[PDB]
Write an enzyme that holds these catalytic residues in place. Structure first.
Site, PDB file in Angstrom:
ATOM      1  N   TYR A 175     -11.458 -11.098  -4.899  1.00 12.84           N
ATOM      2  CA  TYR A 175     -12.216 -10.039  -4.219  1.00 12.84           C
ATOM      3  C   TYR A 175     -13.642  -9.943  -4.698  1.00 12.84           C
ATOM      4  CZ  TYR A 175      -7.436  -8.366  -4.369  1.00 12.84           C
ATOM      5  OH  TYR A 175      -6.080  -8.260  -4.208  1.00 12.84           O
ATOM      6  N   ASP A 199      -9.199  -1.905 -10.089  1.00 16.52           N
ATOM      7  CA  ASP A 199     -10.279  -2.798 -10.496  1.00 16.52           C
ATOM      8  C   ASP A 199     -11.240  -2.082 -11.437  1.00 16.52           C
ATOM      9  OD1 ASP A 199     -10.161  -4.406  -7.329  1.00 16.52           O
ATOM     10  OD2 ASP A 199      -9.819  -5.429  -9.231  1.00 16.52           O
TER      11      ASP A 199
END
Ligand code: CU
Ligand code: CU
EC number: 1.4.3.21
Lengths: 620, 620
Positions: B374, B290
């Protein structure tokens, strides 16, 4: 009319009257322990029987007694003479603390030792330390305390800064005799003071801290009924207090829709051990069971609003008995409040456009206790999402020694000439489980690594495995942080909507367990502390991991004795005993008063609910 | 005029102008990354040189460029053409998210797959997932995204509840071609919704929560000068923001009397990896960096008062560049506040009569980011007693799949037919240490058990040992919870008053590291995640544990490459890289939106101060 209500002053006064009328509480007797008994399994017997257990010490030297009384019927149920040389001595009495110092101040061996050091006997404080069991044959069946000395330069001085090393004495507190004085040699008495309120040590106090104001304009979200029954955000429980264990939690249950679902029948810290790792003969016997030997509940602090407890605080003031059977209130001994706990759940979704945020909260139930130089906070937390957490907060003053010239492998130096022996603080949580009822089992869950090969061609797969503990003989378990090992307590007979058994997962901190050699005295007496997880079948008399009489017991009582019965625990009324602790290599920053350090464990639901239990939490 | 100030809109606009005037930012170009460079070692060069690093993507397919500009002199310092087939692709662009879905909606292989499932293409959302590096030779040197599909029954529906299993497609986003569509078979699309704001799912919202009001009547105890310099309770630091790493802490120092003592030169989460453990070919390639691939800073949320941040809150609003070089403010992207943290220290002394209690406080600096399903909170904490702590808070919606009939060893069932593959969330903290200056070293400290024998006759002794890491080749270390293993960063040339080197101790959570097979692609690309602790010698270009271009790099860059230089680290300018993470076996309670779970680490002083640094804290 709850059978789990706190003992009241009237009940303790009635116990005293029952005992007196029965001939068991004359002027030579002292109450060494008094506590309410929990109800028996199956409270379907209408109208409770409030029963009390009492340990009665006799200061004239007669054998002590274990007595059970029924306050409801005004009768003694049973009274047994104890053989302490076999089953252990009674807990230390508060009135025996000062006896060690006064006997030593007239012993010519003690006075000679102080004279060689040029110490004034009127300045020498003596710590009354539990004795344990070692090589001294003459101690079997005698009530013994050992004493280590500290110099107090003036009445408000911190004695802990001036340990008198090389000196230790053993004292028989019933016959009032000094059995031994051991003098291995003269060490300088460290001279620097450790007075943490002295301006010459603190400097000018900071002026930079602005107030933090925590208020609840509409009052708190929990309710207290019947003295000690708490309802808060679907949780329900009874807050009990025992002079030995301190705060006890009963009947922890969660309201899931219309049904009240049990989770934990009784939760407590059932034992505490502080072993010291200094091989010097002056201290190599040093181990304290603060719970089992001293009773941490009787030393609970009165907690001050805005200092110990900050916010909108509801207090309980538990009642204990003094050594004569008179009720004694611990004013503001238990704090309860809720507090903000950050983000509960949050998501901003790219596809639906919905932004969602919710706050978390926890309910806090705590007390603080002080045993000599140590102060411990016990904190139970209930969270909105079903999590239960325990936290011990350790502070106070470190136990000191001289720091040897040439150094030490078992002591760190805090100040010129001032040492602090290495030690551990190890706790035993006793969790009488009732996950959705009493038919429970424990599984050990490990992460499973998988090999690159057919059916795992890219080598990315991993899994888990669960092993059911079926008999007590296989339920003594070790941590394994490397494989992510946790334990699940489930109910094989209660299923969630996916047809799986409901459960709770125990998350440990995986700190080291008891470090002493397995052949040592402390490893025998504190056997529970050698393993992270024990599971037993419930029995009414298996209350403490060390047994009922820890003081001067030779070893083996409690958990190893229980485990040996090899009882069935697969889908049974079971008890989880979790060992956790801190290994303390003292640092300079721990001196002269130490900042809080913490340890604990938590339990989170594991398929207990059918979906997240906090969908109905509002935005605020 | 701090060289560590946040980038301003004017600076980014000036970068855009410099790049345009130089011929490097025409209409076919896109800024894939833009960030300020930290000053070089030795800021004794008066007047700073504010320099920016830029990654420039070219949408016509020309080779991308790495460019460094000096905003102070208005000049391009260097511009290099990148060979992405060798050194990796640029980070994913936000404008490429929606390209995966629109290319697939006109591919006849995709349309045939949806037709077999009776799915309407206008309802099918496609997640733009990074591709990694596997067996597909045709992807080398191409910018590739992979797509997994979810059904959205209506525009406000949670697509995550309706995964379309057995289907995956690969897309070249520069040439706008669908390279592969893979259809392993039809799975039912789970039908239950996961809409956590729908009253039919939440039930009536609780009315039992009363408000908790946290205010500071005199304002907060910290000061902010120069945009981003913080002073709070002896602490001093600069809060930076980078579009890749997010919040960065610079120049963490502590005022000990009259001297300002450095502790940490730069602290950041330098990488993040989420590997999935499901061996299905539909998902066995699934790993997200990420930080390195998506840039977590550019997805930072605007944080709302009273919802995300509660109390007296000071905001920073960092400025980043969009894909054309225009400045873009993240309003209220960083929250800073102090909060109460319970008891700091407490002792009630039996001999002196003195009762002492002090409160603790922590300074909080946080931001939240959202990458698809997320959401992650990053929290840095400074405590009164010198402790520094990091906490990651994981929440959002779990990534889903079908739950197979007959079960799975790598997926858990959340709802009828609905699965959630097992996965980890693994972080890399990069701690450029400066304990009392730049001459530092790291020691590994283990508890040492001792045998009952001469000089340890009672078997109670235990000790510790410290091993100095002297060269990079020996500084790749594993946790060992069983032996209490921690790491100390000390300065061998700066001594406390006891003549010992000053230090800080790193306390890890000892959670499992990367579980994938060591021969896997993810173990090569995420090598940092296979070990708990790495130490390197500082170098200006060694910034990320995975290298500069993580997207589609074949493996080995970053830490393993740095470590191979075997540089001297004993009393040198060193960097500590700590790996920590969560292993996530999803539970029913994680659905339909999951309660926060947490992981982190902390550093506590270890003989850094000459006594407790909080003696001067007042009573309040
Ligand atoms: Cu300690
Ligand atoms: Cu997860």
């Amino acid at each position: 009319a709850s059978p789990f209500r706190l003992a009241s002053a009237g009940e303790i006064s009635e116990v005293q009257g029952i005992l007196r009328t029965a001939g068991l509480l004359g002027p030579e007797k002292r109450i060494a322990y008094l506590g309410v008994l929990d109800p028996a399994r199956g409270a379907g017997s209408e109208a409770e029987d409030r029963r009390f257990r009492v340990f009665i010490h006799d200061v004239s030297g007669a054998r002590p007694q274990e007595v059970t009384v029924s306050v409801t019927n005004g009768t003694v149920i049973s009274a047994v003479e104890l053989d302490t040389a076999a089953t252990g001595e009674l807990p230390v009495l508060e009135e025996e603390f000062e006896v060690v110092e006064q006997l030593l101040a007239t012993d010519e061996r003690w006075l000679k030792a102080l004279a060689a050091r040029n110490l004034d006997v009127s300045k020498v404080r003596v710590a009354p330390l539990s004795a344990g069991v070692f090589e001294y044959a003459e101690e079997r069946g005698r009530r013994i305390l050992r004493g280590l000395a500290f110099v107090q330069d003036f009445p408000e001085d911190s004695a802990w800064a001036h340990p008198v090393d090389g000196l230790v004495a053993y004292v028989d507190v019933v016959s009032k005799e000094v059995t031994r004085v051991i003098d291995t040699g003269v060490f300088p008495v460290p001279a620097e003071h450790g007075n943490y309120t002295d301006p010459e040590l603190t400097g000018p106090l900071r002026t930079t801290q602005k107030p933090i104001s925590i208020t609840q304009p509409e009052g708190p979200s929990f309710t207290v009924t019947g003295g000690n029954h708490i309802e808060w955000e679907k949780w329900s429980l009874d807050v009990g207090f025992d002079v030995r264990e301190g705060v006890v939690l009963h009947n922890i249950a969660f309201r899931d829709g219309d049904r009240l679902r049990p989770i934990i029948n009784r939760a407590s810290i059932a034992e505490m051990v502080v072993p010291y790792g200094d091989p010097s003969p002056i201290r190599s016997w040093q181990n304290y069971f603060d719970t089992g030997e001293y009773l941490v509940g009787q030393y609970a602090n009165s907690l001050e609003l805005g200092c110990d407890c900050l916010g909108d605080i509801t207090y309980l003031s538990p009642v204990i008995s003094d050594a004569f059977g008179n009720p004694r209130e611990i004013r503001n001994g238990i704090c309860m409040h809720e507090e903000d706990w950050g983000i509960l759940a949050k998501h901003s979704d790219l596809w639906s456009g919905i932004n969602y945020t919710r706050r978390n909260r926890r309910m806090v139930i705590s007390f603080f206790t002080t045993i000599g130089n140590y102060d411990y906070g016990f904190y139970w937390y209930l969270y909105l999402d079903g999590t239960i957490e325990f936290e011990a907060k350790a502070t106070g003053v470190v136990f000191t020694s001289a720091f040897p010239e040439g150094g030490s492998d078992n002591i760190s130096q805090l100040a010129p000439g001032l040492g602090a022996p290495f030690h551990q603080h190890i706790f035993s949580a006793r969790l009488d489980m009732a996950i959705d009822g009493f038919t429970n089992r424990v599984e050990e869950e490990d992460v499973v690594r998988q090999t690159m090969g057919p059916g795992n061609e890219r080598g990315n797969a991993f899994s888990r495995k669960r092993t059911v503990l079926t008999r007590e003989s296989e339920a003594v378990r070790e941590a394994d942080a490397r494989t992510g090992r946790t334990w699940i307590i489930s109910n094989p007979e209660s299923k969630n909507r996916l047809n799986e058994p409901v459960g709770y997962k125990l998350h440990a901190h995986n700190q080291p367990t008891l470090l002493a050699d397995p052949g040592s005295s402390i490893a025998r007496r504190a056997a529970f502390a050698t393993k992270d997880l024990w599971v037993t079948r419930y029995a009414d008399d298996e209350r403490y991991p060390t047994g009922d009489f820890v003081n001067q017991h030779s070893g083996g009582a409690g958990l190893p004795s229980y485990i040996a019965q090899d009882r069935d625990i697969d889908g049974q009324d079971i008890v989880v005993w979790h060992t956790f602790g801190l290994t303390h290599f003292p640092r300079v920053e721990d001196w002269p008063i130490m900042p809080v350090d913490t340890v604990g464990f938590k339990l989170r639901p594991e398929g207990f609910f059918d979906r997240s239990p906090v969908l109905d939490v509002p935005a605020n």
